[PDB]
């Protein structure tokens, strides 16, 4: 199968300013009937897929002339001569030339926003969960930018990295924010064994880390 | 005009069938080409099966050869994808595609197919309460963990659906081959606890419906 590879993995970008993307194949992507067969699109965050590009260059009707494709042989370029909100998703590249049709990776575009700093709660295990034998520590860290941030659970003043989850929301495309949900899961027994638990989070937005802590009594 | 509405997705057991259907409309199906393509849970895209026009001529990638079979009803605007032999490796998001335009310009909305042995359980829901120990007030955040559940998905509404803004709920995560998931909501801390708050929870797989309303600790 043709290796279609893309690059950047990752594009942040501000409303108003240009982006591009890449796309490489391990093969030409040129057809014996002379055309090259190398399409591009676009996949919003719980929406489907949407064409951007066919043939190389050609711009698909519903697709502002903003998005233009260029390339030959086996090196292509999406380019966006100006970044608009709804652009947010993850960008493809295909090649319909060789048999088995193959699609690039993937780059995801973020669209840069003001920093923000996230709200951060603690909640320790309901009553009920208890009952179960089991105990979540859950800790919400909410509309915050950018995405860099690290997140450490602490019992009784120590790192503890096993039995934590971490879920993050897509980019919000109404205010252009994350959200992460991190969830320390213990027995009940190892619970009822120590007696502080804390979230602590860094990120660009203060000069210290951001805790919060609960001791359950 | 152009509609694919795909349906039949659904949990099966590793080496069981489903067989998948995807009504067209708005647009002369018997003329076009037809494909399946599926959405991984990482997000990756990947080519499953084409068939032609008039569905003499049919193309599968290696992934598939021997086990999927594509078919249409041009008397009934619809195509078909019969899956046998079922692996857990092809969970995916199964969409439905028109190929035309040297390439392909729609795609359906996709239906969802996951392949396990794990068996449907109802999920349980637990309230987050904050900790006795409280403080920042103008607002208060509140939660539900929904913990334990399979196959995906859920629905979480806060309130019945009035409220919408201030939620997150996040994605699910695999724990002890188990679904978890988390919702925040927030609000101000003049509503809560004196207005109540309650988390709605649905689990269509188990034909489940809960509600847990959020009470002070």
């Known amino acids: 199968d043709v290796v279609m590879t893309q690059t950047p993995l990752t594009l942040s970008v501000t409303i108003g300013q240009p982006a591009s993307i890449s796309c490489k194949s391990g093969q030409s992507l040129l057809y014996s009937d002379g055309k090259t067969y190398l399409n591009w699109l676009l996949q919003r965050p719980g929406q489907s897929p949407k064409r951007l590009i066919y043939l190389v260059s050609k711009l698909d009707s519903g697709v502002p002339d903003r998005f233009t494709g260029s390339g030959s042989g086996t090196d292509f370029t999406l380019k966006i001569s100006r970044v608009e909100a709804e652009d947010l998703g993850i960008y493809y590249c295909?090649?319909?030339?060789?048999?088995?049709?193959?699609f690039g990776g993937g780059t995801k575009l973020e669209i840069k926003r003001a920093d923000a700093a996230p709200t951060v709660s603690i909640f320790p295990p309901s009553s009920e969960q208890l009952t179960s034998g089991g105990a979540s520590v859950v800790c919400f860290l909410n509309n915050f930018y950018p995405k860099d941030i690290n997140v450490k659970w602490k019992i009784d003043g120590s790192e503890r990295q096993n039995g934590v989850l971490n879920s993050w929301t897509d980019q919000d495309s109404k205010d252009s924010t994350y959200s992460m949900s991190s969830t320390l899961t213990l027995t009940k027994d190892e619970y009822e064994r120590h007696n502080s638990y804390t979230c602590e989070a860094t990120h660009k937005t203060s000069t210290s880390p951001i805790v919060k802590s609960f001791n359950r009594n | 005009e152009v509609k694919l509405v795909e349906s039949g997705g659904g949990l099966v057991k590793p080496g069981g069938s489903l067989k998948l259907s995807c009504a067209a409309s708005g647009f002369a199906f018997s003329s076009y080409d037809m494909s399946w393509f599926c959405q991984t849970p990482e997000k990756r895209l990947e080519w499953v099966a084409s068939?032609?026009?008039?569905?003499?001529?049919?193309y599968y990638p290696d992934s598939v050869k021997g086990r999927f079979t594509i078919s249409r009803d041009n008397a009934r605007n619809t195509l078909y994808l019969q899956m046998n032999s079922l692996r857990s490796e092809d969970t995916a998001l199964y969409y439905c595609?028109?190929?035309?335009?040297?390439?392909?310009?729609?795609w359906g909305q996709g239906t969802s197919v996951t392949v396990s042995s794990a068996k449907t359980t109802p999920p349980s829901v637990y309230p987050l309460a904050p900790g006795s120990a409280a403080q920042t007030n103008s607002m208060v955040t509140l939660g539900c963990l929904v913990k334990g559940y399979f196959p995906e998905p859920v629905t979480v509404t806060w309130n019945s659906g009035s409220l919408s803004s201030g939620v997150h709920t996040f994605p699910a995560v695999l724990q002890s081959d188990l679904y978890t998931l988390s919702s925040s909501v927030t609000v101000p801390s003049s509503t809560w606890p004196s207005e109540t708050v309650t988390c709605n929870v649905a689990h269509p797989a188990s034909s489940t419906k809960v509600d847990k309303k959020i009470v002070p600790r």
């Open positions: 295909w090649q319909g030339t060789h048999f088995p049709r193959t």
């Open positions: 068939i032609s026009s008039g569905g003499s001529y049919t």
């Open positions: 595609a028109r190929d035309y335009d040297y390439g392909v310009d729609y």
